[PDB]
């Protein structure tokens, strides 16, 4: 606080700015396929390269799953798993994210203006495939589609002037918007993903171990907002 | 699949990805129309 107070008086001791800390704990997402050495030799497609690619794809999938709806029990706590509240930025606990609980396409605008003016510049929408289909399906009371231009243009690149993005692992009636560069810190270890073909322990088998120490937390809880549309 | 493994717990075997074969059998589709040589000879248009 900046106390103007009385000009002609001893100046009072103003309260200092508060600080919060976000404990983003890292946890290993690991894959341990016990491939048989037979297939490695006998395949003429380099089955291990394909297996590592599949493990990388599933690692991206599990990374999205954890960073979206990861409960927190030795996994990255996704921003949706973090507790929610309908209060404003000044009223909310720093731990909790702001959520809009309507019961039409009105709430989205509310959500965008739940953010501060500065977050809107680099704000991004995160929408599930089902929820994106719902938003495109949210019709004017006239009946024509309010988000998408029409059935001809296609998927619109912006929802409220902000680049929309599609996360597959979001809930069926939950949408979010925020400056995730501020709002969510994905944390990887300097080791990164560490693949090790264990073709020694059970010989005749090549156990591909591949783990990455992933973490995720809601930094700057004022930079992410959630919108729980009706369950229908 | 990928396990959300922890520190005390051991790393159990994850299920490997399955591969599916698509068997697109080539089958013949044929036409065997018996035209009379008469119609071939006698049609003003090239009937064949």
């Amino acid at each position: 606080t900046v106390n103007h107070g009385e000009e002609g008086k001893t100046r009072e001791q103003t309260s200092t700015p508060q600080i919060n800390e976000v404990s983003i704990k890292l946890y290993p997402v690991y894959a341990y396929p016990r491939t048989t050495q037979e297939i490695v030799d006998f395949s003429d497609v380099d089955i291990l390269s394909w297996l590592t690619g599949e493990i990388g794809d599933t690692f991206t999938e599990t990374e999205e799953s954890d960073l979206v709806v990861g409960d927190g029990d030795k996994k990255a706590k996704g921003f949706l798993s973090v507790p929610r509240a309908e209060k404003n930025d000044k009223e909310r606990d720093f731990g909790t994210l702001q959520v809009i609980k309507p019961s039409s396409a009105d709430p989205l605008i509310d959500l965008k203006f739940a953010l501060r003016k500065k977050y809107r510049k680099n704000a991004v929408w995160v929408v599930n495939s089902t929820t994106a289909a719902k938003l495109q399906k949210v019709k004017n009371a006239n009946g024509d589609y309010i988000w998408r231009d029409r059935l001809q243009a296609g998927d619109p690149d912006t929802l409220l002037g902000l680049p929309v993005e599609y996360l597959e692992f979001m809930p069926d009636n939950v949408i979010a918007l925020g400056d995730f560069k501020r709002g969510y810190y994905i944390v990887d270890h300097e080791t990164g993903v560490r693949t090790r073909p264990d073709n020694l322990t059970e010989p005749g088998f090549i156990k591909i171990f591949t783990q990455k120490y992933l973490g995720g937390g809601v930094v700057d809880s004022n930079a992410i907002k959630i919108l729980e549309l009706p369950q229908d | 699949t990928v396990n959300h493994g922890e520190e005390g717990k051991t790393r159990e075997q994850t299920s490997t990805p399955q591969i599916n074969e698509v068997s697109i059998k080539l089958y013949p589709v044929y036409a065997y129309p018996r035209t009379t040589q008469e119609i071939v000879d006698f049609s003003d248009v090239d009937i064949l």
Binding site: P33, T35, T36, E38, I39, I47, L51 | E21
Partner: peptide, 5 residues
């Protein structure tokens, strides 16, 4: 990956 098809 095993001998299973």
């Amino acid at each position: 990956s095993t001998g299973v098809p």
